[PDB]
Structure 1
Amino acid sequence: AQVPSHTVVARSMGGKEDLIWELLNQAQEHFGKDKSKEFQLFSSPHGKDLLFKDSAHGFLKVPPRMDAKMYLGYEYVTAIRNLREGTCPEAPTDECKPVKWCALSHHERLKCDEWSVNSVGKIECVSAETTEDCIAKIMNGEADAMSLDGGFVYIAGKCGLVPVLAENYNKSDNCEDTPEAGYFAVAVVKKSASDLTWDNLKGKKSCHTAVGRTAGWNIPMGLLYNKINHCRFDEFFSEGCAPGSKKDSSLCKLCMGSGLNLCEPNNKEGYYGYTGAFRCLVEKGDVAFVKHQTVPQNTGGKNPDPWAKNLNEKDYELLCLDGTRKPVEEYANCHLARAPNHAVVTRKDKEACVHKILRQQQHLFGSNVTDCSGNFCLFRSETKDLLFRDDTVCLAKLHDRNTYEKYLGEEYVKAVGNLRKCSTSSLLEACTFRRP
């Protein structure tokens, strides 16, 4: 088998990583690859393997995200725990243990608990706070499955997870088997400002869904990244709203939530997500970056919320790439770029049980269940878009396409690959450092 390397360890709270890393940086630059004959660090005459290995040739910094369980992997910790505890697993594989779905911050956790009781017991709920933290909670092994958009199917797929079931957005008799095409991403501008074009976005305000998503981050900042060619973005925009960025920015400054919850990427941010980004546009925004399906769902009293009750769609228009304003009903003449559907990811060993359970769960509580108020609906929410997108019909079975790259596809993986030197998500840094 392969094993991870030896590691300098130190305590967590007392520290300190930086000082050890400076000292061993000067050590590796002087003494590693025979720059000095008068002293060697990796070989010694008194004995071999002293203080370090002999076959080492240099030192690599461990990222601050990666703790020991993420360091060793999952198979190695599982094997060493079955070996300490002394259990040979038989596992005949007939029935399925209940799936531990993951939630986040008191609205997902509420809904998830209600679904845990309305199912007979096959679904149980464990909550995290941000979505990166929950993906890590799937890797080390407390949480089983999660639904998340394609920009996080890229990260979690790079960390070693597989997508199983996809979400459908189109109503059909054969929706459960047909692989859909993928939704479109647009940018919505006011009618009150008709001066906005794609050729001039500089110094004018913006609204994003969340940092790292498809329609809020990858599709905008890829096509923007060709034109600006700078990695920072709070210089190109005067100010905007993109939650999940760092607190020093103007991007977290213009956002809504309070107190201490501004720019925090959960539902406790008022401008988070699709409907929150649209509310950013309506209240304080110049351009927003959402899916194409946002405006007919927030137009005309479809929300009982007041600010969405008063609005109309013939005002709020979408702009193009060449600069020509296209009306709202035609999105296909000018979409920014396509985005793949949201998909449910899990670990590889639970793929059969997540598959068999969720196909059972979509039949009982899915889209044919009318009388939605008072009884339980799995997909209908109160436009917070929680656990699943609110307009999903069914969830498609994926055969022959279960990886991150085959699911997401070539143009999108190329797009995030163009964006890849600017992504600041620390979990991506950790899952890249694990690679040789």
Structure 2
Amino acid sequence: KTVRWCAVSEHEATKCQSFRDHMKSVIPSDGPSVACVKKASYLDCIRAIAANEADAVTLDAGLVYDAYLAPNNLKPVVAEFYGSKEDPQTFYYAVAVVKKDSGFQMNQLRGKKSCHTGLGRSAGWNIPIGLLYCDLPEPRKPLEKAVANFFSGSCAPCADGTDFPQLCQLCPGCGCSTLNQYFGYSGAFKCLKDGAGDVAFVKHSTIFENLANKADRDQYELLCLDNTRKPVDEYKDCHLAQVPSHTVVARSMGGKEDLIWELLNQAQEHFGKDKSKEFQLFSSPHGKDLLFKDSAHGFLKVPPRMDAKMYLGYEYVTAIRNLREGTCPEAPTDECKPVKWCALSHHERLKCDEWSVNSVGKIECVSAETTEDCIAKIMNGEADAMSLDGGFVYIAGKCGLVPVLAENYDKSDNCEDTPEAGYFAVAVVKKSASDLTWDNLKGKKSCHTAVGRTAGWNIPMGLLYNKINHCRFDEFFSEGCAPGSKKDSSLCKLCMGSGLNLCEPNNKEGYYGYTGAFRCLVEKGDVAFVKHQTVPQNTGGKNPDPWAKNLNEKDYELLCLDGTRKPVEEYANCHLARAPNHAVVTRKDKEACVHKILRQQQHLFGSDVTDCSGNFCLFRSETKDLLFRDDTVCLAKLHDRNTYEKYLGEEYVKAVGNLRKCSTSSLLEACTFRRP
């Protein structure tokens, strides 16, 4: 079909007509076409697409947020990168360069000297002041005046010093051009180097452009949003905001996003960077930056799950909203706003609601459709916390959330203190054939508690993905039983069960669970994937069943990842990976509050005296493990500022990640697109 692009000037409108003409040529008779709808401005192109009069346009961050707001409600469908297919550089980072050991944190700039790249610029002002908005003295309008009282002097190019002198103190006159060496990225940075100002709100690339030698940067460092500093080389881990450089948008519903991609893509390949000589898609013969930015290297599809909020990022959004809405809480103090939990089900909403009233307002509830939606919500700001299993802890991590409290299941006189890292997913094989290794495990017979399990599938299959390469996880083992397959695979054809319960993920199956898989080994099975607590539990006659009558633990041996072999005695050093417990996650900030609020709450309705029924019990569920596993003794503190990686272990993260190449999830790729 034909895509109606939208230009905002006659020049840009001409270039669109060449794009239409040049396509009807190098594009098959039935390929992506491109019509041209010119308008007066960006906001008009936006509204036109909203009205289905236009199909798409390319906008900067600012206007991207503008296209999201109703009634427009548009979303990002295609981005432009400025590097290689390895180093896309689709975004840029608004940072705040400072001096080593300066002595201050973002949350305490009050009474400082700042260097902005120029008033009204994004990285240099909108974003920095947007963030510091409520930290300014009332009235907050005019804006220039308020920022003056905050920053005890500074350099704000293009700002009217005549009415508010404080902003041109470091650079009198506030020269809005190069005539002023403290104007711009380079200039604002020079305003810090020269020692004039304390902080230089600039871009991530700024310091690397005004300083070649590395030993030079060391004296400089970034200011992070969680009141911390870090090396200017680590901006991706410490930036005031992440903003998309240039984005193609379309109606969120019926915006023809796929068709827009089929055009842009099939176009960057015909007339893309240096591609053709007949037409330079990213070049403007008449003027600069038309339809696409001149410096664009190509296009990149945006994951469909992505929407403007998630795309711009929490920092960005919060900053621009302050700027445009201007709304701050009356009584600050930071008494920790109620924690918004996320229910992903009716019964979960109910249990959460009961929890709410019994929290005296400390806890609030939010309802999202899916575990992934909640996660998006905890990123957005719409939700604050929630518990997730290892698989989703990983996904929340890649999305920027963090683990704060891990659900503990064992009991002691100090459950909250000592954290639990979970059991171990080991690989057991009959020591009858001493020649089997993690490597020659291919083409043999396996045993899986059930496809989709942590210990009997995810971990092993994920750690073994390298050999498999392709997503044909069954075509790796000659046979074996893994309940849950297509009921006829190489792994399902070795499972008993009736004509219906044949190879099924339930008790009605024989080789199901941690016991069934061990059985599968005692029979038609070379390798069996289970947990450390399965061997000395299904042997010694501890199982009065026919097969496990009294098998011997000593006759089985554990396989280690490095390649060697070891007994079930010291599995600790011969396990595939460690399966974690569920853990509550939250946005980086809010961490202290969640950590705090969830403690008191745990003392009031936790695993206290068996006084439920007549009182609310936070770890008991109407139906089954609702907001929390019903076997959660307490919410242990992760002590160290555990991050999804430090909390899952390297083995675990590797497993899940590989496995995610076959079992995609909309949320995960969207977050990855923003941070690979």
TM range, normalised to the smaller chain? 0.7 to 0.9
Q: CA deviation at 1:100?
A: 1.1
SS at match of 1:218: helix
Distance 1:89 1:306, change over 3 A: farther
Map Cα deviations across residues 375-416 of structure 1 (whole Å, 9 max, x no partner). Answer: 322113367222222222221122323322222222222333
Contact 1:401 1:407 in 2 (8 A): no
Q: CA deviation at 1:433?
A: 0.9
- Report the Cα distance in structure 1 between the residues aligned to 2:347 and 2:430, rounded to whole angstroms: 31
* Aligned pairs for 1:80-95 within 5 A: 80-87=320-327, 92-95=332-335
- Report the Cα distance in structure 1 between the residues aligned to 2:342 and 2:548, rounded to whole angstroms: 30
- Looking at CA atoms only, which structure, 1 or 2, has the larger radius of gyration? 2
Q: How many residues align?
A: 436
Q: CA deviation at 1:124?
A: 1.5
Distance 1:111 1:21, change over 3 A: same
* Aligned pairs for 1:164-313 within 5 A: 164-185=404-425, 214-215=454-455, 218-223=458-463, 225=465, 228-233=468-473
Distance 1:126 1:63, change over 3 A: same
Distance 1:2 1:207, change over 3 A: same
Contact 1:113 1:125 in 2 (8 A): yes
SS at match of 1:306: coil
Name the structure 2 match of 1:11. 251
Distance 1:432 1:348, change over 3 A: same
- Report the Cα distance in structure 1 between the residues aligned to 2:295 and 2:323, rounded to whole angstroms: 28
Name the structure 1 match of 2:343. 103
Map Cα deviations across residues 22-64 of structure 1 (whole Å, 9 max, x no partner). Answer: 2211221122221322321212222111111112111110111
Flag structure 1 segments of 5+ consecutive residues without an equivalent.
none
Distance 1:415 1:320, change over 3 A: closer
- Report the Cα distance in structure 1 between the residues aligned to 2:667 and 2:524, rounded to whole angstroms: 32
**Aligned-pair Cα RMSD in Å:** 6.2
Contact 1:188 1:317 in 2 (8 A): yes
Contact 1:152 1:212 in 2 (8 A): no
- Report the Cα distance in structure 1 between the residues aligned to 2:361 and 2:539, rounded to whole angstroms: 38
Contact 1:103 1:127 in 2 (8 A): yes
- Report the Cα distance in structure 1 between the residues aligned to 2:607 and 2:656, rounded to whole angstroms: 33
Distance 1:104 1:328, change over 3 A: farther
Q: CA deviation at 1:156?
A: 0.6
Distance 1:229 1:176, change over 3 A: same
Distance 1:250 1:307, change over 3 A: same
Q: Which moved more, 1:18-27 or 1:91-100?
A: 91-100
- Report the Cα distance in structure 2 between the residues aligned to 1:230 and 1:157, rounded to whole angstroms: 26
Distance 1:30 1:230, change over 3 A: closer
- Report the Cα distance in structure 2 between the residues aligned to 1:396 and 1:17, rounded to whole angstroms: 45
Q: CA deviation at 1:110?
A: 2.3
Contact 2:565 2:574 in 1 (8 A): no
Q: CA deviation at 1:160?
A: 0.7
Q: CA deviation at 1:368?
A: 2.3
Q: Whose relative contact order is higher, 1 or 2, with alpha carbons under 8 Å and at least 6 apart?
A: 1
Q: Which moved more, 1:369-378 or 1:144-153?
A: 369-378
Distance 1:208 1:387, change over 3 A: farther
SS at match of 1:189: strand
Flag structure 2 segments of 5+ consecutive residues without an equivalent.
1-240
Q: CA deviation at 1:213?
A: 7.0
Map Cα deviations across residues 50-106 of structure 1 (whole Å, 9 max, x no partner). Answer: 111112111110111101111111111111111111236687334222111011222
Contact 2:462 2:657 in 1 (8 A): no
Q: Which moved more, 1:323-332 or 1:363-372?
A: 323-332
- Report the Cα distance in structure 1 between the residues aligned to 2:644 and 2:481, rounded to whole angstroms: 29
SS at match of 1:429: helix
Q: CA deviation at 1:431?
A: 0.9
Name the structure 1 match of 2:385. 145
Contact 1:299 1:312 in 2 (8 A): yes
Distance 1:56 1:194, change over 3 A: closer
- Report the Cα distance in structure 2 between the residues aligned to 1:197 and 1:99, rounded to whole angstroms: 49
- TM-score, length-scaled by structure 1: 0.72
Distance 1:4 1:323, change over 3 A: closer
Contact 2:477 2:490 in 1 (8 A): no
- TM-score, length-scaled by structure 2: 0.49
Contact 1:129 1:266 in 2 (8 A): no
Q: CA deviation at 1:360?
A: 0.3
Q: Which moved more, 1:53-62 or 1:296-305?
A: 296-305
Map Cα deviations across residues 220-275 of structure 1 (whole Å, 9 max, x no partner). Answer: 42245366543144767999999999999999999999999999999999999999
Contact 1:189 1:287 in 2 (8 A): yes
Distance 1:123 1:218, change over 3 A: same
Q: Which moved more, 1:307-316 or 1:329-338?
A: 307-316
Q: CA deviation at 1:336?
A: 5.9
Distance 1:304 1:70, change over 3 A: farther
Q: Which moved more, 1:404-413 or 1:298-307?
A: 298-307
Q: CA deviation at 1:13?
A: 2.4
Q: CA deviation at 1:145?
A: 0.3
Distance 1:241 1:5, change over 3 A: farther
Q: CA deviation at 1:210?
A: 10
Q: Which moved more, 1:207-216 or 1:253-262?
A: 253-262
Distance 1:408 1:337, change over 3 A: closer
SS at match of 1:60: strand
- Report the Cα distance in structure 2 between the residues aligned to 1:107 and 1:222, rounded to whole angstroms: 33
Distance 1:432 1:198, change over 3 A: closer
- Report the Cα distance in structure 2 between the residues aligned to 1:165 and 1:42, rounded to whole angstroms: 49
- Report the Cα distance in structure 2 between the residues aligned to 1:184 and 1:303, rounded to whole angstroms: 22
Contact 1:241 1:254 in 2 (8 A): yes
Map Cα deviations across residues 113-142 of structure 1 (whole Å, 9 max, x no partner). Answer: 221222222112112232112111211221
- Report the Cα distance in structure 1 between the residues aligned to 2:331 and 2:287, rounded to whole angstroms: 47
Contact 1:161 1:348 in 2 (8 A): yes
Contact 1:207 1:281 in 2 (8 A): yes
Contact 1:222 1:416 in 2 (8 A): yes
Distance 1:90 1:255, change over 3 A: farther
Q: CA deviation at 1:173?
A: 1.3
- Report the Cα distance in structure 2 between the residues aligned to 1:342 and 1:360, rounded to whole angstroms: 20
- Report the Cα distance in structure 2 between the residues aligned to 1:182 and 1:174, rounded to whole angstroms: 17
Q: Which moved more, 1:360-369 or 1:299-308?
A: 299-308
Contact 2:284 2:290 in 1 (8 A): yes
Contact 1:222 1:418 in 2 (8 A): yes
SS at match of 2:530: strand
- Report the Cα distance in structure 1 between the residues aligned to 2:283 and 2:669, rounded to whole angstroms: 31
Distance 1:333 1:161, change over 3 A: closer
Q: CA deviation at 1:428?
A: 1.3
Distance 1:269 1:155, change over 3 A: farther
Q: Which moved more, 1:331-340 or 1:95-104?
A: 331-340
* Aligned pairs for 1:287-366 within 5 A: 337-366=577-606
Distance 1:283 1:350, change over 3 A: farther
Map Cα deviations across residues 342-369 of structure 1 (whole Å, 9 max, x no partner). Answer: 2110112211221111110111111122
Q: CA deviation at 1:207?
A: 11
Distance 1:383 1:12, change over 3 A: closer
Q: Which moved more, 1:390-399 or 1:415-424?
A: 415-424
Contact 1:234 1:251 in 2 (8 A): yes
Contact 1:199 1:322 in 2 (8 A): no
Contact 2:379 2:587 in 1 (8 A): yes
SS at match of 2:572: coil
Q: CA deviation at 1:157?
A: 0.8
Contact 2:384 2:590 in 1 (8 A): yes
Distance 1:289 1:104, change over 3 A: farther
Distance 1:73 1:246, change over 3 A: farther
Distance 1:51 1:247, change over 3 A: farther
